[PDB]
Amino acid sequence: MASEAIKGAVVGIDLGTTNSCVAVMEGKQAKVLENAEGARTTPSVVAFTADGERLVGMPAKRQAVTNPNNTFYATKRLIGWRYDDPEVQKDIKNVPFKIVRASNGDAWVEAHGKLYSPSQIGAFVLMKMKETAENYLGHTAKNAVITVPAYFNDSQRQATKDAGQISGLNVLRVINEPTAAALAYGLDKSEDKVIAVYDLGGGTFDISILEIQKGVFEVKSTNGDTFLGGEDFDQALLRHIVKEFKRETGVDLTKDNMALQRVREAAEKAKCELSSSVQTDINLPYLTMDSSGPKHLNMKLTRAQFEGIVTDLIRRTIAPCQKAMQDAEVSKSDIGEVILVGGMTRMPKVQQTVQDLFGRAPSKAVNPDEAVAIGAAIQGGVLAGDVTDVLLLDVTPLSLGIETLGGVFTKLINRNTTIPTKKSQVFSTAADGQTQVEIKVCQGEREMAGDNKLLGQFTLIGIPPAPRGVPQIEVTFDIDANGIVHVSAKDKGTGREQQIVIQSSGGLSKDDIENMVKNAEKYAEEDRRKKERVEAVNMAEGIIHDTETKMEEFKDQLPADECNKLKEEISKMRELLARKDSETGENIRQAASS
Amino acid sequence: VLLLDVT
Amino acid sequence: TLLEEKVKLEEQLKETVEKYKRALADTENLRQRSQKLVEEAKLYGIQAFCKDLLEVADVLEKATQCVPKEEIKDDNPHLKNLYEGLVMTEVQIQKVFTKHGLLKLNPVGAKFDPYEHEALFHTPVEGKEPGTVALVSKVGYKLHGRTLRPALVGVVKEASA
Amino acid sequence: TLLEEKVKLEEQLKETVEKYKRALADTENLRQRSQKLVEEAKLYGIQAFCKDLLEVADVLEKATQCVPKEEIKDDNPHLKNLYEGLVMTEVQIQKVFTKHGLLKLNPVGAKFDPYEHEALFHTPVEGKEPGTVALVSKVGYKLHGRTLRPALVGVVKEA
């Protein structure tokens, strides 16, 4: 068949067991969309009330206690499976909700005397996420790319496709989670390689060995631990904290409910803090109230203690990965890249284990929590419409602009501006009676004239005399095609134009984009301060010039010895120790009235 | 000779 | 080959004309969505800061509640001054909270709404309409209609009889 | 006749490709400008929040510093417990402030800086350099490196 003419917006939905994420192609990069509550990840929970409701997400989690037999969670472990299955038989006992058998002998669910397939719960979740995407987009999201685990068979992939179709989504393709992570990490455009995708942090641990031969991804092997996730690490930390609190004081927080939630949140923040900091503190004033008085929790937690608390859990990820490499028929030297997915992989202990296990320092340049959805968005942008056209659209490496009377760097075109762009700005003459106007073109990121570079320079000669500020000169940059900059100065009202075709439009393509903007951020507040200083100097100089010109116009019966505040202004000018001269700019007195 | 800026 | 090549090139020309039309549509849609996002970021954007300070506000309220208030006396003047400072701090944090749209949710007897309330228990209570909130364990907050923290409530259940 | 079709098609194709590239670059620049506008709105909201947040921390710290340290003893259990809870609360407040870019300004002995400090009074002090913060009357604050509230300092003069 010919081109399908999608001509629309393709969302990438990461349909997870616990939490789902949706992202879209925002030009050259994927953007993870936040839901109606401002959270980027939506729980895959659906619930039905007595009369009729379809609470999806956190609204269903909050109501779960009041409606435990009609709140369906972790249904992605029931999709594509028959009723008479081992794993389904283990799962039916624990789940509070009802799991029934359909006519086709499939494990369905029951809610107030109604039958829903495990694909229909996912369809409701996908409807919620499609609404989330549409709210940001403003139009309908008709196409979608939905990710599935690499161990799904064709039946479960078809169930996911049907779930996407029920939600009103034209599912372009059903992608893997390892493949989506590889696309997010940018291994799609790479030579033939074997990569390992380390997925720790969700409700499951997954390790998949992939091959990128010919430019396409093949799943060589898959493995993991089903009963290991990111909740176990937090549970271990919380247990350690409450045990320490009971040891130090004598009160068990397990009986308390509010205190347990406070300690759980504090443990989550402490675990997130022990990935960049060696030590952390857990402060919880007024944790519990006793007959002897309130008790305040104060714990010092170091990274060594944390990595000793969860050492067994991390060690439980070494046998599955070795077995996955055995199934793929590869060794440590045969792995060309390691990919980190999941929020629990940010600790240096997990990354050290991965490096010691695969022989390669893991790739951690992408947010592991939102990598599958971002890769699905990338794949959707590639599959449909034209996104690669914006991918080949070259952008400016560094910002461009011209000079300014006070040495300021007036920025016409900023740093990350696509090349075929024309921008124009109008500027006035410097002083009264000025006829020669000179343009100084320079490139950089600092707010100063000569502190960045100097591309070229020309002159606009020929200007009718006029009072300062009245002549209008339209300086326009004409960056066209791909590359060279056609700077042109236009004297609005009259002729005598000027032009230049300055070369080296990012010709020195190097890490200057990474380094010149690196030290332009540290030296920013000081640069802003000096720029404000020179702006105030220019304003005060203009005001004093206006006052002097007005004073030299009226002289008779003018006892303006009190109007000598310009002396104080000049004294303030010769002082590099003040914030700005705007506050002392109140020197525009015109009591003479022309 | 230096260009100004419109306020 | 000349005529077929010309026809194919004209087809490509029409395709890229349609691409240009699509680009104009996309930039119009982007203008609309950007004007939406700016207002959204003006309303919210202190969401993370507010969610971080909620626990400080709760701790200040708990501190006010914890002092027995029988020891607030001129006999103990330093505990009195500290208590007045704590009370002033609590009223100040609640005054800056409601200034920026952060409103407290305390549904003492409202109907259970699973969009601002997180049910903690389903204990049946006599004399109360089923489905209402029996008690609020922790007050919830919301800014500009966005439920930051749900009110941890306890919903009542129908009598078993 | 038929050759004119080639010239017309080539000219139209080049003009249309130029227009299409320029229109595809317009949307990207508009997107980047919109991102800048949204970031500016977020920054303004957070700054306006912090400006009125500062008073809460000021009141709490003044309250917990008023109490002398010699009366926090075991024969006043209610004063000791309240003092410990309140100092832990202000530590929590300052940690939350630091996490979100808001940093304190306590330039004890640091050199004077007009962009961060405000000279409440000028008085010579022995053992301290001129133009140096001998005493800080009120603590200042910084938001992302820019002074949200200048510190009220005391500048050593020449005697």
Numbering used by the authors:
A (entry chain A): 46 to 639
B (entry chain D): 435 to 441
C (entry chain B): 59 to 219
D (entry chain C): 59 to 217
Task: Reproduce passages from the article.
In human mitochondria, mitochondrial Hsp70 (mortalin) and the nucleotide exchange factor (GrpEL1) work synergistically to stabilize proteins, assemble protein complexes, and facilitate protein import. In bacteria, mitochondria, and chloroplasts, the GrpE-family of NEFs interacts with substrate-bound Hsp70 to facilitate ADP and protein substrate release. Herein, we present structures of full-length human mortalin in a nucleotide-free and substrate-bound state in complex with full-length GrpEL1. To stabilize the complex for structural analysis, we introduced a point mutation, R126W, into mortalin (mortalinR126W) that is associated with EVEN-PLUS syndrome and has been shown to reduce mortalin’s ATPase activity and conformational flexibility.
Further refinement yielded a 2.96 Å resolution cryoEM map describing a complex consisting of full-length mortalinR126W bound to a protein substrate and a full-length GrpEL1 homodimer. Firstly, we observe an expanded NBD devoid of nucleotide that is mediated by extensive contacts with one protomer of GrpEL1, termed GrpEL1-A. Secondly, we detail the significant bending of the GrpEL1 α-helical stalk domain that enables interactions between the GrpEL1 stalk and mortalinR126W NBD and SBD. Finally, this structure provides insights into the interactions between the SBDα helical lid of mortalin and the second GrpEL1 protomer, GrpEL1-B. Critically, the lack of EM density within the nucleotide-binding pocket but strong density within the substrate-binding pocket suggests that our structure represents a previously unobserved intermediate state and suggests a step-wise mechanism for the nucleotide and substrate release action of GrpEL1. At the first interface, subdomain IB of the NBD contacts the β-wing domain of GrpEL1-A via a salt bridge between R107 in mortalinR126W and the carbonyl group of P172 in GrpEL1-A. Here, the mortalinR126W IDL is proximal to the GrpEL1 α-helical dimer with residues V435 and L438 within the hydrophobic IDL interacting with L82 in GrpEL1-B. Compared to the predicted GrpEL1 structure, our mortalinR126W-GrpEL1 structure exhibits a ~ 13° bending of the GrpEL1 α-helical domain. We observed strong density for a peptide bound to the SBD substrate binding pocket, indicating that our purified complex is substrate-bound. With these factors in mind, combined with Hsp70’s propensity to bind hydrophobic peptides, we modeled the bound peptide as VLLLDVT, corresponding to residues 435–441 of mortalin’s IDL region, into our cryoEM density. Second, we observe an interaction interface between the SBDα helical domain and the β-wing domain of GrpEL1-B. Here, Y173 from GrpEL1-B inserts itself into the mortalinR126W SBDα, forming electrostatic and cation-pi stacking interactions with R578 and R574, respectively.
